[PDB]
């Protein structure tokens, strides 16, 4: 949805979606990876998604 | 003149050849085989011992093949210059290149296997006789086997040395004092001793002279005697297993497949009778363990040291079971029945303490391997294990175990 709003020049609406993502979420996706159900490296959709969210923040 | 015309000579040539010259040229042929120049490695062999010569040719052949095997066990590691004040100026060694003793011992074993290939591939193995060993004649193929059993155990002794250092360095010092030799101060006692693999066995007299001394100078209120007994037993155990395991897993690579003759009574090092004989080592340690450790020990230490004692008694009887397979019942029966009674007596002397100490699995694993029917039957009645006795009345039936058991029930039972 931020990929849409930034292309649509709605930079404040992309920042409204950025504020809908709680700031713990980047660590919570690692918490959910060490107690098993997933393996020691983050799922490859979601490491790339965290890297993309960090691109969007920058 | 000069070139193709000047007489190539210098160390004399073919129309004389002394016994040093035969060894220094058979060393050339083995070094040519270690270049895979087989065409010339053979031409030196077929000149040195040409197949139309006197019956004394083979008394030089067993000798040169033995000396080159001793020289390879005892080789000087010419990559390490701690030896550069400690090597002779003529020395036709084998240049073990690895800067660690474990790898010198592995590289001597790799090279020994290529010496056995050279001896098969240039046909020589078909000519081997019986070199003199320990003051008897011994079939030279079994001496070449023994030299690699000594290497096999030296690799174990160097791996227990890298765990148990100053127990082993002290037994090495006692063994080197029994050679009267000065240790070069550029080296250690371990480098001097792990040169001489031809004598790696003398450690097993000295380890018990150190163990007896800890069992004379230390308080029984300590743990340290129990760790010495455990660690000396593990050194003897794993070396004597590495000897017989080598002997068993290469029992083809030392064998005449045909013979028209009678090979002598084969006594390997692991079966030696004498003051430092490995039988007398196993007997000393069976006295020591049963008279010193087993009275003082706990329930767990008594198990450890029993499985160790079982591994020493097994090498002792393996050593008789081999001997009673080279003496002949048809044409040396005067030796045979008397060696068979020596075995049958020492079989019970060594195993009756495992029975009396109530270790019925360890008395019986052994008595089932060596057919000791008295202690088989005694363990059954001392457990009332009539089902295991019936299992023996099935298992040993070609060997009349039931006829024996029926005396045992008639007499005292």
């Amino acid at each position: 949805i931020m990929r849409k709003f930034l292309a649509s020049k709605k930079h404040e609406a992309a920042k409204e979606v950025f504020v809908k993502i709680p700031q713990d979420s980047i660590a919570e996706i690692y918490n959910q990876c060490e107690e098993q159900g997933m393996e020691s490296p983050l799922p490859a959709e979601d490491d790339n998604a965290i890297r993309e969210h960090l691109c969007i923040r920058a | 003149p000069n070139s193709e015309s000047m007489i190539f000579e210098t160390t004399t040539k073919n129309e004389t050849i002394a016994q040093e010259d035969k060894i220094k040229l058979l060393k050339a042929a083995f070094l040519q085989y270690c270049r895979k120049d087989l065409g010339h490695a053979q031409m030196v062999v077929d000149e040195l011992f040409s197949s139309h010569s006197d019956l004394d040719s083979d008394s030089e052949l067993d000798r040169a093949v033995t000396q080159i095997s001793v020289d390879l066990m005892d080789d000087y590691p010419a990559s390490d210059p701690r030896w550069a004040e400690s090597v002779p100026e003529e020395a036709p060694g084998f240049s073990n290149t690895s800067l660690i003793i474990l790898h010198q011992l592995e590289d001597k074993m790799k090279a020994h296997s290529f010496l056995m290939d050279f001896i098969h591939q240039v046909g020589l193995f078909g000519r081997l006789g019986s070199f003199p060993v320990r003051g008897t004649p011994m079939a030279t193929r079994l001496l070449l086997c023994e030299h690699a059993e000594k290497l096999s155990a030296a690799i174990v002794l160097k791996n227990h040395h890298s765990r148990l250092s100053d127990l082993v360095n002290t037994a090495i010092l006692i063994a080197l004092n029994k050679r009267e030799y000065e240790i070069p101060s550029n080296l250690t006692p371990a480098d001097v001793f792990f040169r001489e693999v031809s004598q790696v066995d003398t450690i097993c007299e000295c380890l018990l002279e150190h163990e007896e001394q800890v069992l004379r100078d230390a308080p029984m209120d300590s743990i340290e005697w129990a760790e010495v007994v455990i660690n000396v037993n593990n050194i003897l155990k794993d070396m004597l297993q590495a000897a017989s395991h080598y002997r068993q897993n290469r029992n083809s690579l030392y064998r005449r497949e045909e013979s028209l003759e009678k090979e002598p009574e084969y006594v390997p090092w692991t079966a030696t009778s004498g003051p430092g004989g490995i039988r007398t080592v196993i007997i000393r340690q069976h006295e020591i363990v049963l008279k010193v450790a087993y009275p003082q020990a706990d329930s767990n230490l008594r198990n450890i040291v029993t499985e160790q004692l079982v591994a020493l008694i097994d090498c002792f009887l393996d050593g008789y079971v081999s001997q009673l397979k080279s003496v002949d019942k048809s044409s040396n029966r005067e030796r045979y029945d008397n060696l068979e009674m020596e075995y049958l007596q020492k079989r019970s002397d060594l195993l009756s303490p495992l029975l009396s100490l109530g270790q019925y699995l360890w008395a019986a694993s052994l008595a089932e391997k060596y057919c000791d029917f008295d202690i088989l039957v005694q363990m059954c009645e001392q457990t009332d294990n009539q089902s295991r006795l019936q299992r023996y009345m099935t298992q040993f039936a070609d060997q009349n175990f039931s006829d024996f058991l029926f005396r045992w029930y008639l007499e005292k039972g």
Binding site: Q36, G37 | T383, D384, N385, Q386, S387, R388
Partner: protein, 170 residues
């Protein structure tokens, strides 16, 4: 149905029907059914080959076969004679000896570890079942070898499973 599959050599079809029918608890209670499952899983392994597919099918079929042996052994101990229990335990021993080569970390490696535990539990059960009928045998030797069996069957470590969050199956 499993007769009618195996006679037509529809062996993967028979095992796939077992993979559905084993979900009925009223079949898993039958000695007859578990005997048919254990023997059908062998006859399917006896048709698999050196292919990259079969190195997956052979894993499932051996996990199934060792678990079906452990349940057939529970039922045979409970319902049959001592010799009927020997020949089954000796068949389960033979099926463990093949899988014993697969030192690794898949769920056949995990099943094999747990099935050492069930094998020694059933072997200790066979020695005490021998004692229940063997009027002339000393109970010490049977109970010593049974205690060794239970000690091994206790010390086999509990499977270190991974709880995920969709999977309502125990």
């Amino acid at each position: 149905l499993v007769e009618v599959y195996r006679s037509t050599k529809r062996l993967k079809d028979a095992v796939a029907h077992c993979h559905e029918a084993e979900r009925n608890i009223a079949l898993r209670s039958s000695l007859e059914w578990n005997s048919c499952v254990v023997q059908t899983l062998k006859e399917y392994l006896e048709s698999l080959q050196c292919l990259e597919s079969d190195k997956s099918d052979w894993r499932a079929t051996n996990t199934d076969l060792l678990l079906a042996y452990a349940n057939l052994m529970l039922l045979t101990l409970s319902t049959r004679d001592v010799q009927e229990s020997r020949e089954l335990l000796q068949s389960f021993d033979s099926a463990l000896q093949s899988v014993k080569s697969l030192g690794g970390n898949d769920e056949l490696s995990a099943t094999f570890l747990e099935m050492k535990g069930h094998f020694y539990m059933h072997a200790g059960s066979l020695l005490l079942k021998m004692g229940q009928h063997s009027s002339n045998v000393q109970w010490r030797a049977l109970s010593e070898l049974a205690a060794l069996c239970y000690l091994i069957a206790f010390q086999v470590p509990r499977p270190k499973i991974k709880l995920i969050k969709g999977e309502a199956g125990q």
